Design a protein around this ligand. Sequence first.
Ligand SMILES: OC[C@H]1O[C@@H](O[C@H]2[C@H](O)[C@H](O)[C@H](O[C@H]3[C@H](O)[C@H](O)[C@H](O[C@H]4[C@H](O)[C@H](O)[C@H](O[C@H]5[C@H](O)[C@H](O)[C@H](O)O[C@@H]5CO)O[C@@H]4CO)O[C@@H]3CO)O[C@@H]2CO)[C@@H](O)[C@@H](O)[C@@H]1O
Ligand SMILES: [Ca+2]
Length: 171
Amino acid sequence: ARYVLAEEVDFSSPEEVKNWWNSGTWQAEFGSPDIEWNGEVGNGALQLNVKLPGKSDWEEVRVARKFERLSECEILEYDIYIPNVEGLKGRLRPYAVLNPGWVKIGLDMNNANVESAEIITFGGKEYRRFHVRIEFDRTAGVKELHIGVVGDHLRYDGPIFIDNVRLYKRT
Ligand SMILES: OC[C@H]1O[C@@H](O[C@H]2[C@H](O)[C@H](O)[C@H](O[C@H]3[C@H](O)[C@H](O)[C@H](O[C@H]4[C@H](O)[C@H](O)[C@H](O[C@H]5[C@H](O)[C@H](O)[C@H](O)O[C@@H]5CO)O[C@@H]4CO)O[C@@H]3CO)O[C@@H]2CO)[C@@H](O)[C@@H](O)[C@@H]1O
Ligand SMILES: [Ca+2]
């Protein structure tokens, strides 16, 4: 099948951040501010301030945005960056959800142990980089994309960044 890019969010400007909201948590917490713009990471990225205790297999924080063409789309991609602090252990289990309908997509398709990760550099600082690619079916009536950042025995108190959110549809 062939696809074109329908929507893309690169967070080049802080005014994009108002389109995103905190859609909840599960066995994890947001700090304050929960979500903010960061202009160094990714030349602009969405910064989630999180606290994951690292005691269970599913410790989730979630952000969301409306996308008018979401019901026409079939592939989602995004990047997650985590500061390359020494000693971090555990697994990320990132996924996403389409709503209305709370349609969970990509469950356990992009899981990554943090210990053996690609790195990327911004501003002379290193970040662990995790790419997420999810295929799904055209889903009628959906209008919101929720991105779920999930830790699995990943004890971490600090920022996690999202960037390069891309949605593709068929030509
Ligand atoms: O407010 C918005 C929205 O929230 C809804 O509630 C959400 C809630 O906030 C959470 O996001 C919750 O999250 C669940 C995930 O969707 C998913 O179901 C996840 O499933 C995991 C599971 O926990 C477990 O880790 C499992 O591990 C397995 C593994 O699959 C394999 O079988 C292996 O062999 O065994 C292990 C161990 O058993 O893997 C699953 C993923 O594949 O569980 C999360 C915790 O429950 O989802 C809720 C919705 O279901 C609602 O309040 C809604 O009303 C509201 O709109
Ligand atoms: Ca960016």
